[PDB]
Amino acid sequence: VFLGFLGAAGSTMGAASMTLTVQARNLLSGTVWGIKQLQARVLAVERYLRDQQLLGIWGCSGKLICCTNVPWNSSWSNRNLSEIWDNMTWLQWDKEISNYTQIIYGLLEESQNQQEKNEQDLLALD
């Protein structure tokens, strides 16, 4: 079924993790007024690129869902699988992990370059 942009707001993080390509979709394309238009037109690509920037300095240029090699520090959440994917919503979930998102991102940054520096060595010997 097709709900709409942001339609799975109050949906469980499992059901909301279905409709990802819809929120990712309506995110780019869509003299007084003339200037408003221009610093809104750049703001949208700046804000968009800053996310692709992250996905790219991780390994997740795929993208949508992307697994990684940094293990989940229980201190961050510690909740069980069911009670976040089949229970909580992303609006809710965001505020819990909010305290360490940038610290989590740092774990990701080092881990990706570590992968690359390694994979060169594999293709080097083989």
Partner: protein
């Protein structure tokens, strides 16, 4: 009931104990999910496990469960003192409803006893202004949770007016029961003495009083 639990099981402290939850194919266990509750008498229950093995939030690792093709069970480890209570399971699926079993009490042993704190309160001056005459024999802080309240009257037991009750688990893992009995108001200065016996296994206690007040 249809869902068959066990009657009672036992275990030491820092020990392990199990409990069955079997039933016919109409209820258990193939193509069916099973839950497990800690339901204290006269108090709200507590959910332990669901979907056979999934532990609820706020559940120590020691608690565990397994569903065989013919029977379901629950295993409890590292036996703590407060685990001494009554438990229930339930057959359920997504669309249908719950079907509670029969009932099982857990009897944890390897547990130290306790000397009873007895304090008898006789009837007040206002109570007799009805007129009705009774007594208030109360007993607390004892293990195991089982006693027998007896009485006497001139070298022979009492054959009327008895109202005895059961024990119950307290906030400090101990047990406490009460007992009352009615006497005629003309049996005060006329009858000499009267015993209020409450026997226990470790030692014996009693609160005897002779009406001359």
């Amino acid at each position: 009931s249809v869902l068959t639990q066990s009657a009672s099981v036992s275990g030491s402290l820092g020990q392990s104990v199990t409990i069955s939850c079997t039933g016919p194919n109409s209820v258990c266990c193939s193509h069916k999910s099973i839950s497990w509750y800690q339901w204290p008498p006269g108090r709200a229950p507590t959910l332990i496990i669901y979907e056979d093995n999934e532990r609820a939030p706020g559940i120590s690792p020691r608690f565990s469960g397994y569903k065989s093709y013919w029977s379901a069970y629950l295993t409890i480890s590292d036996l703590r003192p407060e685990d001494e209570t009554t438990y229930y399971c339930c057959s359920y699926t997504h669309n249908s409803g719950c079907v509670f079993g029969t009932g099982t009490k857990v009897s944890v042993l390897g547990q130290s006893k306790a000397n009873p704190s007895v304090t008898l309160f006789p009837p007040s001056s206002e109570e007799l202004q009805a007129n009705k005459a009774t007594l208030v024999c109360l007993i607390s802080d004892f293990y195991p949770g089982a006693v027998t309240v007896a009485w006497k009257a001139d070298s022979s037991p009492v054959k009327a007016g008895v109202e005895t009750t059961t024990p119950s688990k307290q906030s400090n893992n101990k047990y406490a029961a009460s007992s009352y009995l009615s006497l005629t108001p003309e049996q005060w200065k006329s009858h000499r003495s009267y015993s209020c016996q409450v026997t226990h296994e470790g030692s014996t206690v009693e609160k005897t009083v002779a009406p001359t007040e």
